[PDB]
């Protein structure tokens, strides 16, 4: 039969991960440059490496040191396939060791001097014949392998960049995948395009074509069920499936009582009314509040909420007839992290999995949704935890507390959006603390906490630099408009040592 | 492809500064839209075939003699009409109502009847947090109308006649300050007016590529390439539509940022495979600017020499029928002479692939085509470049210093994530000196602003330690700089650029 | 030394929130002053023998009947009189003028005649940058008056009758918002009223030491010593005046900051050589507070136990005639509003006579006195500390476990504020213990500390402090990293109004 | 003859300076504790040390290392006088070296208290600990015999020591800095408990001492004082007025480089309010003429200093029979770290009166407060000798000074109004002779660009640009642009010291 044209993944880069926290950034930067990419652990089998058919290979950094026994090595086939190879920091060091060089034992900015312009450096520079890079100060290449030439250096790091342009092996002692390296994108672009010969077909407009066709091929005339939350990933999945298979899609939305003000109404408005998708709404507030009654331990709260949600979803799924497929919003980071019953549903339900985002990074999901016409407010919304307000009401969850928190959180959101600071944070939300303070008669009422952070990875996060007068306007509004709130505090704890959510 | 503009909304402009926001929010909801002045002829309104009409706000009063009125055909086509503030006031007056003469501010309106416009929407229960227009108010609603929302000060905050499908609000749903404003307008264009959702970046690309191939055929097109968002998206669209028929001319006027010319060539010629001719004209611009201190004279000189350099490059090409420009829909709305301002011997026909798009639609288009974030979300760069960021006489010595200090500024803003948290940022060279440790050297100024429209702007809320990091880097890495200052002047009464 | 109060200015209060600022500005200009309600009896005013009278502003309108007026004796003593806002309006009415009916704002007034009040003063040339009270204006100036300053919007901004020496301004010279306000009031008390400048810290010390020796003689005096500014300055003054006749009792109620008791003993007993009896009462207060969650009940318990501990210590002393207290002039001062409404609160067996060496002094004068006597900056500029101490900074039940944690976190906060220079850039700063927990990182599940810091001049309105971002981050990181039982730090971002400064 | 009673300086501490930038802070904390102190270089002669009669000696820190060649040593008599000695960092290290110990070659630390001597006493931050500002580097590897280690860290086993028989004390951290939480209390235990000193060095007693000393020096003779209105000359004026009354004459010179109405304000306070004889010399035209065409900042400073002395000398020559010139010299000016009177022409031969020359800056302020001088006078930021002459970049012109005076005044008004004046150590406007565009409604402005400068600092050796609130700075720039037609734009100096200076020229 006719099958989906997959031309836009023919050009591809393989990233072998040696342990660096930046390894996924390499893969993401290749995709931003218009080239398909996948990442695997360094000990990827030779069979899989050949079967992948890479146009080029990038060896990431890692927290290891080659001169220690049992240190990671690249598979030898990497240097024998006849395709270019780029080694980043440790990747450069293990490339040197395995090709006749030597590595001698030993993070910050450095200005490397361009001593030879190969095809990786090309015409690039910051200051003249220099590159402002993010350097890993540690191990260094003591002797470059046969056929290599030093292309860049610093006084303290004489081997900052090298290349054997006959075998097309390249290496840098700095990280081009991070923003701290000013020409990092441009360097990686030179590697995948000029050096590896890859085109630029991996773009949102082409990915939509590919994925709609692949979905049609997988699903055919069959029905697909989607758990719809209104988060970015499930929203784009719903839009993709609606475009692909139309009314063969059915969505189930569960209101667990732990959502923000009018969130359920908003999900129905956008997906059922605006977009014309079939959406079943399960209103389960009382069930969740009952399951949570008297539960103060946060881990127990998270367990209960996850369990009741699965039960409610399974109940709704059982009312449907002849649904072969369960769609989920799995993204490529989920799949990378797993290799480092379907849907977790009870066994009476037997779905096959549909995962249209499973090969996409988070920014690609957003670009896809924008291309499909999904509005800014939906695509750029901050993440919302699975347990919802269940982990933003400290200790016991009560309906009275959730209702107050919804009002206070909505004021916070309104002011962030009106002022333009919503998109200038990565996460923001109110927290209900079940303690009271005095305010002016003289009344005595709950203390609300505001949480807002700046981050790119959510692995480190700083409390947000919100303007003084914005914060003051928000706290004044919360206290003036909610009789049950005496006082507002702001979380001034960064990650680490604090977490982003309080529970 | 042309099916994607068949559903369409007409916005009649009564003078509000928010009128274009109405048209933009319709497009964001997935429906094509156009905006015209209120006095649109009945012939043109009928020809537009609107699925619905929105009457904007405005700074006029219905009771004043000669005040604007909607042409009565608006209420006779049998399509829904939404009046916003003045649009509702003139709607009431022209349908047998009364308006009582009377500031902007927030208001909590009470929902009293849930019609098709309000629907199920609310903020607090049965309320809406809105950006209210005080002053003139409807005192008697026309026959067939029902009050749908109110405030104590404003008993007629919203109304509808759902038989004739006439809707009205006394607040502004088109601004962010009305919490459910997007949703109210969505109910109007989709639920009330029956419009679908085909006006999306993926479909707009297909339509515009088709239209470009129809206009251009196999003929050649010339494009002035700057690197700004508009010219970048035009270049990508044209490259897709007509391939090798496109020729770009990029002019390095000596007033660009560090390595800017190399980066333009790297991206458009090398990465994207577009034919780009680079005119290196630094000496020409510096020679023309030498000894010229008046900023208006500098701007005139730079604009004149740019056109001359562009004309000289264009004359070298053979058989080019078309000149492409990055005109956007706000440019056409504002407009309502040789092509390109070029000499008479150059007679091009105009190609304008973005002329029906707003700024954010242009960016969504570029993103859909795979253009990188750094290109699409770049801050604007003025025509005269560094020529208006070097106070008084422009000398190569000053431009070279400024390029280094500006580059440090940009590096720190991008690295810290604050580049995208400002609307505009750049360094300025002041030809004055101060002492440092002994050093006597130039004083650099940093400019950064927050704004959504560039009409009013506040100086940016950059974190103290980021600014300290930037000034310390500049002073430590550039021997010729003694000190860094930060522009703490908002617009108005300061302009964004210094010259 | 009593000469230093012979020159004196009387301020009649018509209800303005700035009325006390007038009296304070007079004292800063070196002239003794007192403040009373507008309805001060004529016999009292004559007995006061003022060298000049200032009629303050007020929240009333002269056109509405039932509104306050000044006693005519004010305009009949032959001493200069200055009317501020409402004081100018009622002066105009009662002297043959008219006031028409008409909020606060800045204004540049034009000087049209340079009398003794305006003098050679100006901001921009022949102008004054002032803080105006709009609303009611003077339409007809009284006879004998010349208009001395004006605005387009307010043609009568300042007046004077230099033969009768009656002066009036439509703006408030007593507030910082008026750029030349100090200098105008200086021209009034010195040039116009002839007052000298003897009311200064060095002379006040000599007068007060002399008066204390006259009141106390060779008798014994007991002082409750808290470590706050007022009690510290009382202790220093009494030590100077009566030496070994002074006995201090300091009570550690278990609700003080880290090492606070040791610091009181170090400074007052060790350094200054004063007799200080230390009552270590932590267990007693914690036992009385255990299981008590209501904040009003906590305050009542703490106040009751403190008096009981103090009384038990007072009973151990032999033949003590006087109890000294840190009462200051704001505690006693007569307002237009305050007029509209056993010693030490001790048991009956304890009958002391009251000594109040600061009762005629404003807060800043108390600090200047302490500085003059050599008390260190850290003692004189300490933020206030509430009577109930940490009792109202631990939400709900007070436990030793919570107080110990709070002391550690508060001490870190104070260290960084004093180190960085921001302690003196706030009016009040402290940590609060919230008995709620949050997750941290192995996983931590521990208490959430709140930090409170405000900026204010009067404590009637206060904004949360503009602490630098990186300082707050340094404080929160230290607290979380150094106290195992704290997971997270929050910052109170609530201003007054509508929030209070203390949480309980 | 009866001479001034100097009992309040009998108790005294000698500080020997080995080169630390914090050495003066030691001397200042002793005075804050109520004890007179003086500081001299480490190589103070035995004769002078004995003549000083110290009740205690503190050996300061230093950048040197005991084992470098030519490294400083304390005069051995320091350990032979029978008075207590405290060594701070290098002072501890050289104390150990010279008493038989061994020395083996900046950040916070929590030192563990292991033995409570009379220096540590009952002090602690966290229980049995001290939060201190440590000097990582040279460590005492072997304490002299008779010493006990009193405090330690894991990385610095010898953080504090004492031999309480000889009363020698030592710390590896700096108690004189604000970074050491209990630093004041530690120094207080040393000067009071350990050295037995009282607390008579207080503002009220200093006033009595200095007034009597001034009367003894001056008698019935006349005194001339150059009066600028700065804090030091203001306190000198107030002290001399109290001491000698109408024997004092002041001369104030308006050099045309002062702030708005500054001359009027000097006359208003000293001549009118305080009743002091003040001669006013209005010399603006003279200074502007001398500065015409001068762009080099060092030439401007030289010209302004020279012309000021000439103007002052002319006023001084009009006075008959004046024996004394008073100056506002303070102890930092004199102090010993590791020419005609007043710099006047030779025809003027004054004897010097210097009532503040043994006082630190904070003590000068306390004296002024004691005398009743207003807060605004006592806590005023410093103002440079050359005035606005170094705040107008390049050539000084009357047009620029007049504009700058208006801009600076707006800045000061808002700082004082908001309470942020006292929350900075220095603040001023700068006139840059460059222009930029503004929008004034439908009209275009093209006018000068004003810079604002404000810093936070304690020592003026390092200074950070001030953390002024966003909305306050916006209020200031809006006011300046809206009230001064000749200003298009306001910028804020965001350069800290180092690598920038506080003043621009
Ligand atoms: Cl809800
Ligand atoms: Cl962010
Ligand atoms: Cl987290
Ligand atoms: Cl360049
Ligand atoms: Cl912005
Ligand atoms: Cl502008
Ligand atoms: Cl304690
Ligand atoms: Cl404050
Ligand atoms: Cl309060
Ligand atoms: Cl002046
Ligand atoms: Cl400061
Ligand atoms: Cl400096
Ligand atoms: Mg509900
Ligand atoms: Mg204890």
From TrEMBL, chain C:
The positions annotated for binding ATP are: 226-232
Question: Which of UniProt's keywords are assigned here?
Answer: ATP-binding, Glutamine amidotransferase, GMP biosynthesis, Ligase, Nucleotide-binding, Purine biosynthesis
Q: Name one Pfam family in it.
A: NAD_synthase
Sequence ranges assigned to domain GMPS ATP-PPase in this UniProt record: 199-382
Q: Which CDD domains match?
A: GATase1_GMP_Synthase, GMP_synthase_C
Q: Which catalysed reactions does the entry list for this protein?
A: XMP + L-glutamine + ATP + H2O = GMP + L-glutamate + AMP + diphosphate + 2 H(+)
Q: EC?
A: 6.3.5.2
Q: Which GO terms describe its cellular component?
A: cytosol
Q: Which InterPro entries match?
A: Class_I_gatase-like, GATASE, GMP_synth_C, GMP_synth_GATase, GMP_synthase, GMPS_ATP_PPase_dom, NAD/GMP_synthase, Rossmann-like_a/b/a_fold
Q: Where is the active site?
A: 85, 172, 174
Q: Hey, which pathway is this one from? A: Purine metabolism; GMP biosynthesis; GMP from XMP (L-Gln route): step 1/1
* Organism superkingdom: Bacteria
Q: Which GO terms describe its molecular function?
A: ATP binding; GMP synthase activity
General function of this protein: Catalyzes the synthesis of GMP from XMP.
Can you state the subunit structure given in the record?
Homodimer.
Q: Can you say what this protein is called? A: GMP synthase [glutamine-hydrolyzing]
What species was this sequence derived from? Acinetobacter baumannii
TrEMBL record, chain D:
Transmembrane segments annotated in the record for this chain: none
Its pathway, per UniProt, is:
Purine metabolism; GMP biosynthesis; GMP from XMP (L-Gln route): step 1/1
Molecular function (Gene Ontology), one example: GMP synthase activity
**Taxonomic classification:** Bacteria, Pseudomonadati, Pseudomonadota, Gammaproteobacteria, Moraxellales
The UniProt catalytic activity note for this protein reads: XMP + L-glutamine + ATP + H2O = GMP + L-glutamate + AMP + diphosphate + 2 H(+)
Name the GO cellular-component terms.
cytosol
Q: Which residues form the GMPS ATP-PPase domain?
A: 201-380
Stored HAMAP family: GMP_synthase (MF_00344)
Entry-linked PROSITE patterns: GATASE_TYPE_1, GMPS_ATP_PPASE
This chain belongs to the protein called: GMP synthase [glutamine-hydrolyzing]
| Function comment | Catalyzes the synthesis of GMP from XMP.
Q: How does it assemble?
A: Homodimer.
Catalytic positions are 89, 174, 176
Keywords of the record: ATP-binding, Glutamine amidotransferase, GMP biosynthesis, Ligase, Nucleotide-binding, Purine biosynthesis
Q: Organism source for this protein?
A: Acinetobacter baumannii
**Root EC class:** ligase
Please list the residues that bind ATP: 228-234
What EC number(s) does the entry state?
Answer: 6.3.5.2
């Amino acid at each position: 039969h006719m099958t989906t044209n997959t031309q836009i993944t023919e050009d591809r880069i393989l990233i072998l991960d040696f342990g660096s926290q930046y390894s996924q950034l390499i893969a993401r930067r290749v995709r931003e440059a218009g080239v398909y990419s996948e990442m695997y652990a360094f000990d990827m089998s030779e069979e899989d490496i050949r079967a992948f058919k890479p146009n080029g290979i990038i060896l990431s950094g890692g927290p290891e040191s080659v001169h220690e026994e049992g240190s990671p090595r690249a598979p030898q086939v990497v240097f024998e396939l006849g395709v270019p190879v780029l080694g980043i920091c440790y990747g450069l060091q293990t490339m040197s060791e395995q090709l006749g060089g030597k590595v001698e034992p030993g993070f910050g900015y450095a200005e490397v001097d361009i001593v030879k312009r190969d095809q990786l450096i090309g015409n690039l520079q910051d200051r003249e014949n220099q590159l402002h890079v993010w350097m890993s100060h540690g191990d260094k290449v003591s002797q470059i392998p046969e056929g290599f030439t030093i292309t860049a250096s610093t006084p303290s790091c004489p081997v900052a960049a090298v290349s054997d342009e006959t075998r097309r092996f390249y290496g840098v002692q700095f990280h081009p995948e991070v923003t701290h390296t000013a020409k990092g994108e441009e360097l990686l672009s030179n590697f995948v395009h000029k050096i590896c010969g890859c085109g630029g077909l991996w773009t949102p407009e082409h990915i939509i074509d590919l994925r709609v066709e692949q979905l049609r091929e997988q699903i055919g005339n069959e029905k697909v069920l989607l758990g719809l939350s209104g988060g970015v990933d499930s929203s784009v999945v719903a839009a993709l499936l609606h475009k692909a298979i139309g009314d063969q899609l059915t969505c189930v939305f569960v209101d667990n009582g732990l959502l923000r003000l009018n969130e359920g109404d908003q999900v129905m408005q956008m997906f059922a009314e605006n977009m014309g998708i079939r959406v079943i709404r399960a209103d389960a507030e009382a069930r969740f509040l009952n399951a949570l009654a008297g539960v103060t331990d946060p881990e127990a709260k998270r367990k209960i909420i996850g369990r009741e949600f699965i039960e409610v979803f399974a109940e709704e799924a059982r009312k449907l007839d002849g649904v072969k497929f369960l769609a989920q919003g799995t993204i490529y980071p989920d799949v990378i992290e797993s290799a480092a019953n379907v849907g977790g549903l009870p066994d009476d339900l037997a779905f096959e999995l549909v995962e249209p985002l499973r090969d996409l990074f988070k920014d690609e999901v957003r670009k896809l949704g924008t291309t499909l016409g999904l509005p800014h407010s939906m695509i750029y919304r901050h993440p919302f935890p699975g347990p919802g307000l269940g982990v933003r009401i400290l200790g016991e969850v009560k309906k009275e507390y959730a209702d107050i928190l919804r009002l206070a959180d909505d004021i916070f959101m309104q002011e962030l959006r009106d002022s333009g600071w919503y998109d200038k944070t990565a996460q923001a939300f109110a927290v209900f603390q079940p303690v009271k303070s005095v305010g002016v008669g003289r009344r005595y009422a709950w203390v609300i906490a505001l949480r807002a952070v700046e981050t790119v990875d959510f692995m480190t996060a700083r409390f947000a630099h919100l303007p003084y007068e914005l914060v003051d306007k928000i706290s004044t509004r919360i206290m003036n408009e909610i009789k049950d709130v005496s006082r507002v505090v702001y979380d001034v704890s960064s990650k680490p040592p604090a977490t982003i959510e309080w529970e």
